Amino acid sequence: SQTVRVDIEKLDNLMDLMGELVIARSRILETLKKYNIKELDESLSHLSRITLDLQNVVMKIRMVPISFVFNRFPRMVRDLAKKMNKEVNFIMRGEDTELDRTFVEEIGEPLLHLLRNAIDHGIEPKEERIAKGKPPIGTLILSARHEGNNVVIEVEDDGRGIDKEKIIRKAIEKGLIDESKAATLSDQEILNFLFVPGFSTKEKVSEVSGRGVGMDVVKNVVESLNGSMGIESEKDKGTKVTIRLPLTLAIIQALLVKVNNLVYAIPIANIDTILSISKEDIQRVQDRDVIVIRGEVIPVYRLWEVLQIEHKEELEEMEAVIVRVGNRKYGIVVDDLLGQDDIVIKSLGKVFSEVKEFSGAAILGDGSIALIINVSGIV
Amino acid sequence: SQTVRVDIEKLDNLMDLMGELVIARSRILETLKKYNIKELDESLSHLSRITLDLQNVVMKIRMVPISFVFNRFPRMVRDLAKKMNKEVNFIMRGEDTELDRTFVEEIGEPLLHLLRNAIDHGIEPKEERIAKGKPPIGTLILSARHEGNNVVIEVEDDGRGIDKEKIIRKAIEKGLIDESKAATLSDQEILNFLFVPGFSTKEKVSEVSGRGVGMDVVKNVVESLNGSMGIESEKDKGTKVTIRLPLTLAIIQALLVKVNNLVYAIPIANIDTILSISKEDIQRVQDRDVIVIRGEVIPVYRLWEVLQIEHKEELEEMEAVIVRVGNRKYGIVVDDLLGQDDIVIKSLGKVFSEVKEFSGAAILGDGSIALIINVSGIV
Amino acid sequence: KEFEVLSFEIDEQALAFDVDNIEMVIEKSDITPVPKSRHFVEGVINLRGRIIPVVNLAKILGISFDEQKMKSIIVARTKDVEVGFLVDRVLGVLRITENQLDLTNVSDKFGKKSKGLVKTDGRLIIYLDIDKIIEEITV
Amino acid sequence: KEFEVLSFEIDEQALAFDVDNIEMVIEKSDITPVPKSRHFVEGVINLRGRIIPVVNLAKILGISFDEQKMKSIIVARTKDVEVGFLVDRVLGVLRITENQLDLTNVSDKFGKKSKGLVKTDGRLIIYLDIDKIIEEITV
């Protein structure tokens, strides 16, 4: 019908009101199971119906397409192609892919420095393109999609590829890794040295295009926003970059577990499976225990131990949650398993910033506080 | 910096779902009235507050600043002024003043006509100003602001002004006023005959079919959007036109009354008093029912009679609402008095087009339907 | 062509219009009276967040009825408007064929608002056209 | 300068910090435990939709105290952090005069994180420095 303007301050207050409405839904629900009223269920269910409709409308206006933000970026690539005397086709498929406004703003100039180093580094001049018999104009692609609790940004080229063979040799010069370790590695872990701060600090003060390959600058931001980044490259097949980031601000789909009847939430996004294990199957080879499950051997940790909560008595069949971290995954043994729900992170403030184990509280539906386990904070 | 691009239709839908939450609020209040629990009284008190805060924010983001229509004028006005061979200064203030989607779209063309007529009639060419020893550059001021829980838009020129003697004498010549009524009428009241057809010739106003936007149209449109419009003019002091429009259609203050246990809303602004009258007093002279109140004679009407619906036979001491229209006021007898609220006016419907007594239906907070009475629809 | 229509009667006379133009079906509960209403309309109800008029079909067509026996509102749906039609009992969804369809409506009151007449299983089911029926009720 | 402070007690000794750095005041009820937390903290509470840490003031000052006696949580508010302080009775807002404020820091053993001492013919109201008290918890 007609496009209008709403500023971010107005949407920030609307977000708080949506938060106060979700609390009121939970406080009527508390009242309902307190007094056990059949008619109040119907009254609340209708409220909850309209509120679900309102919630998803508020989420739609909170999220923005990436190409609304990146609107000037294909023009910048054209001007940098013209500067270097190169022909390249830029493909941008981001109009249907929505991302949060705080996430998109922090990662935009990062992504611009990635593309700006790529047009210099991996995109070929016409003479070198047709020397290899490759299609006469370069192909550089930005795209995105939605996967589970996350939004996946994807960048790909048909360019030169990255000199992985030289990168391990440079890594030995810089003192980054051992040589026998370098021979153990797979290709996508060689490229992961381009996500090490200080491996390459090379820049241009004329261009102001970002240090290094324009990738350790992006990785720091992606980790800061609690995401996860991947890379693959092959010589004259081009390079591809995968970036996973949270679906929405503050909301964290979780599995609520308990130690001595104290609620500790476990992030469902990170997970891998849930299993009932025996203590008679827990074994040890080095300094810490393990269990062989599904033929694989998983490094088990005792929730109550890393949090220092006394264990009064021992029962044989233990409940375990397998969580993924980095490229791997560790076991978290728990005392009781409550039940999943999608919670909202609350800061514990400056006095509790030091603790790696937990980065945030959260308010449950009975008004109770419950802390959230930090998966990369324990191990 | 960041800001939101969204269709007005989506925030109209967010307003619609907000009005569903009012009904759900009224269904939890029903449960509270049966079950009387302080927990739920508290939970509803917090929900009542959140719904009131939330409905203010949705209404606020849905309102359109008039700046889009305002900045359509300066280039149009300059080209007109040039063709009309004159020089005006345009002064435009209160630019991002907020009003409804319906009102911003309807008012734009009648206000363009109001401005067009102000330069054509009002603002003199330079040589006429030099002959009157007056400054050659005209001054035309368009100013918008909030006042009285409504929106005020002032338009004024430093021009010729209007001959009040010509307007009054033409009203006698066209048989629209009596000679002694004309001789007793004040200057500010005489200039309202400008807004009656035939006191200007410009832009297709004598036409039977396909009529243009006359000055009558501008007054009628303002009134049709439930506003008020005033004029004041004087010789060589220019002409000043004041338009007062509501903020939105979602806050129309009414007094809800019932006959036959059926909700009929009465526009609060027009009123004059609410009085319980005796059956002995009411009398007929040689027309319909009258009542002598303050020694003055008021034409009393029975709501159910003027609406042609079956009702009580027997006399009782009846409650009457005195409503003002034009320079007068008539009595409306009603059965019971429900309770005031700021309501949302909706259309009566396309099967009911012939009915003149109701301006618009409406959905009340408990889901009840209530029609809104037209103050000038009953004679 | 295989059209699937909604079958229903009024005073033992069969009628039907397409399923394409249906919103839902309800039982009449508290239809709000509108003062000064034309003879063929009962009033208005709130359904699916919209204000729906409840017309009395037989008083548009020009056929017999009983207003204590009639108790079923068939809510229709065009691009232009959604309107409920108060009638008697309802049957349900019926796939009709062109082979048993006749176009003779020379003697019918609503015969220029009828798409045809379906001669199925010894019944005289008259096929209506929602559009031209809604054009008559509008003021 | 006429300073406005919040007056409240611990163990028959009066204390106070400014109203500028107050959110509100409440009476104690169950304090949610945080695992592996500093010894001068009780835990966390939900106050006005925020998660406030509930500190034990007397374990920061190093003064003698009786834990059961305490029952008043004074919630403070600084730019860095918002923190509740568990203490004894509260009075309310006390306007103090600069004329009666002594600024000596060696009078008692907690005088460095104390802004001064208000001299009076009732119980001596010791003026604390909220700033240096929040500066202690973050090390």
Author numbering:
A (entry chain E), B (entry chain C): 293 to 671
C (entry chain D), D (entry chain F): 9 to 147
Provide the authors' own sentences about this structure as they appear in the paper.
(A) TOD: receptor trimer of dimers. cascade that regulates the motile behavior of the cell.
TarCF:CheA:CheW in a ratio of 9:18:18 μM. monolayers containing reconstituted core-signaling complex arrays. 11 Å in X and Y directions and 15.8 Å in Z direction.
